[PDB]
Design an enzyme around this catalytic site. Structure first.
Site, PDB file in Angstrom:
ATOM      1  N   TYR A 181       4.425 -11.802  -6.748  1.00 36.44           N
ATOM      2  CA  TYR A 181       4.311 -11.619  -8.194  1.00 36.44           C
ATOM      3  C   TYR A 181       5.104 -10.408  -8.689  1.00 36.44           C
ATOM      4  CZ  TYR A 181       0.873  -8.029  -7.009  1.00 36.44           C
ATOM      5  OH  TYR A 181       0.247  -6.921  -6.497  1.00 36.44           O
ATOM      6  N   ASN A 228       1.899  -4.304   3.153  1.00 35.58           N
ATOM      7  CA  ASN A 228       2.257  -2.986   2.601  1.00 35.58           C
ATOM      8  C   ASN A 228       2.522  -2.064   3.776  1.00 35.58           C
ATOM      9  OD1 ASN A 228       0.346  -2.351  -0.475  1.00 35.58           O
ATOM     10  ND2 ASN A 228       1.381  -4.210   0.225  1.00 35.58           N
ATOM     11  N   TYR A 253       3.477   1.885   4.631  1.00 34.47           N
ATOM     12  CA  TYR A 253       3.470   3.230   4.054  1.00 34.47           C
ATOM     13  C   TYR A 253       4.117   4.259   4.964  1.00 34.47           C
ATOM     14  CZ  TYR A 253      -0.114   1.300   0.932  1.00 34.47           C
ATOM     15  OH  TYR A 253      -0.795   0.537   0.010  1.00 34.47           O
ATOM     16  N   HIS A 283      -5.331   0.509  -9.628  1.00 37.27           N
ATOM     17  CA  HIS A 283      -5.078  -0.849 -10.115  1.00 37.27           C
ATOM     18  C   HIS A 283      -6.230  -1.762  -9.803  1.00 37.27           C
ATOM     19  CE1 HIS A 283      -4.017  -1.182  -5.863  1.00 37.27           C
ATOM     20  NE2 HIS A 283      -4.251  -2.505  -5.987  1.00 37.27           N
ATOM     21  N   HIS A 316      -8.986   0.384  -7.628  1.00 35.39           N
ATOM     22  CA  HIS A 316      -8.825   1.059  -6.341  1.00 35.39           C
ATOM     23  C   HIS A 316      -7.451   1.647  -6.193  1.00 35.39           C
ATOM     24  CE1 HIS A 316      -7.950  -3.251  -5.421  1.00 35.39           C
ATOM     25  NE2 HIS A 316      -6.967  -2.750  -4.652  1.00 35.39           N
ATOM     26  N   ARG A 346       1.201   3.877   8.064  1.00 34.16           N
ATOM     27  CA  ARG A 346       0.056   2.988   7.962  1.00 34.16           C
ATOM     28  C   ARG A 346       0.549   1.690   7.359  1.00 34.16           C
ATOM     29  NH1 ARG A 346      -3.346   1.210   3.577  1.00 34.16           N
ATOM     30  NH2 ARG A 346      -5.248   0.339   4.542  1.00 34.16           N
TER      31      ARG A 346
HETATM   32  O1  LIG Z   1      -2.913  -0.525   1.242  1.00 32.09           O
HETATM   33  C1  LIG Z   1      -4.090  -0.833   0.937  1.00 32.09           C
HETATM   34  O2  LIG Z   1      -5.066  -0.744   1.719  1.00 32.09           O
HETATM   35  C2  LIG Z   1      -4.368  -1.315  -0.462  1.00 32.09           C
HETATM   36  N1  LIG Z   1      -3.241  -1.929  -1.150  1.00 32.09           N
HETATM   37  C3  LIG Z   1      -3.512  -2.586  -2.278  1.00 32.09           C
HETATM   38  O3  LIG Z   1      -4.545  -2.353  -2.875  1.00 32.09           O
HETATM   39  C4  LIG Z   1      -2.618  -3.615  -2.815  1.00 32.09           C
HETATM   40  O4  LIG Z   1      -1.473  -3.762  -2.339  1.00 32.09           O
HETATM   41  O5  LIG Z   1      -3.034  -4.342  -3.747  1.00 32.09           O
HETATM   42 MN   LIG Z   2      -5.052  -3.717  -4.388  1.00 29.40          MN
END
Ligand SMILES: O=C(O)CNC(=O)C(=O)O
Ligand SMILES: [Mn+2]
Length: 211
Positions: A66, A112, A114, A123, A185, A196
């Site tokens: 998205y 994700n 990091y 968000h 969150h 991470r």
């Molecule tokens: O990295 C995380 O634990 C949380 N990530 C999110 O909330 C997301 O991408 O929507």
């Molecule tokens: Mn999220």
């Protein structure tokens, strides 16, 4: 004010389930696969909208991805890459076997990744895009997921989140109800001390608006 924070934290907790599901070996294997995804992205092998690069956090969208305020849209069918076989085999299968979510539920997997000092701002996972529950599995190191993120904008008025949830390597977090819909969150940069990664498994809504 103190009672209110405790009531909200109780409500948040009612929408959180957490379990240690993946062993150190299982994590190592998945982490190797996440590394493969990063490598493939760098080689330009993914579709345009599969990869979202940002300073200290990259997102990799599979199955569905998205994009003014609160108007995210699903990319047209076939724009993002399909969920990799290893995600089905090593992650989703384990979740289905342990009755975390039903077979067939997941049609979206986002990774994700990091850097140290990386973060994500306050968000709510877009309510028009994703069904609940929202499932996430953490990988390379331990961190914390914060709820009630006003503190990211008003540190004088409010210094702490409503709740901080430890999210350990190999742990599964399931968000629903209040925790998914009624509160924001985020992740604080000081809570990511080393690399991470997280795999977020969700189902998109039938009427998720599309481009
Ligand atoms: O990295 C995380 O634990 C949380 N990530 C999110 O909330 C997301 O991408 O929507
Ligand atoms: Mn999220």
């Amino acid at each position: 004010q103190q009672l209110q924070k405790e009531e909200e934290a109780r409500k948040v907790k009612s929408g959180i389930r957490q379990m240690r599901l993946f062993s150190q070996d299982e994590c190592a294997k998945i982490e190797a696969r996440i590394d493969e995804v990063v490598s493939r992205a760098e080689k330009g092998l993914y579709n345009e909208h599969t990869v979202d690069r940002a300073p200290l956090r990259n997102k990799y969208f599979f199955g569905e991805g998205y994009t003014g305020p609160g108007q995210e849209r699903l990319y047209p069918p076939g724009d993002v890459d399909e969920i990799p076989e290893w995600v089905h085999q090593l992650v989703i299968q384990k979740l289905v076997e342990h009755r975390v979510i039903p077979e067939g539920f997941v049609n979206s997997a986002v990774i994700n990744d990091y850097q140290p000092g990386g973060c994500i701002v306050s968000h709510v996972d877009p309510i028009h895009i994703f069904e609940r529950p929202i499932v996430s599995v953490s990988f390379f190191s331990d961190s914390a997921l914060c709820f009630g993120c006003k503190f990211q904008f008003k540190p004088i008025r409010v210094s702490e989140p409503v709740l901080s949830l430890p999210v350990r390597r190999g742990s599964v977090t399931v968000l629903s109800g209040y925790a998914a819909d009624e509160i924001t969150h985020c992740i604080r940069p000081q809570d990511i001390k080393e690399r991470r990664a997280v795999i977020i498994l969700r189902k998109t809504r039938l009427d998720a608006p599309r481009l």
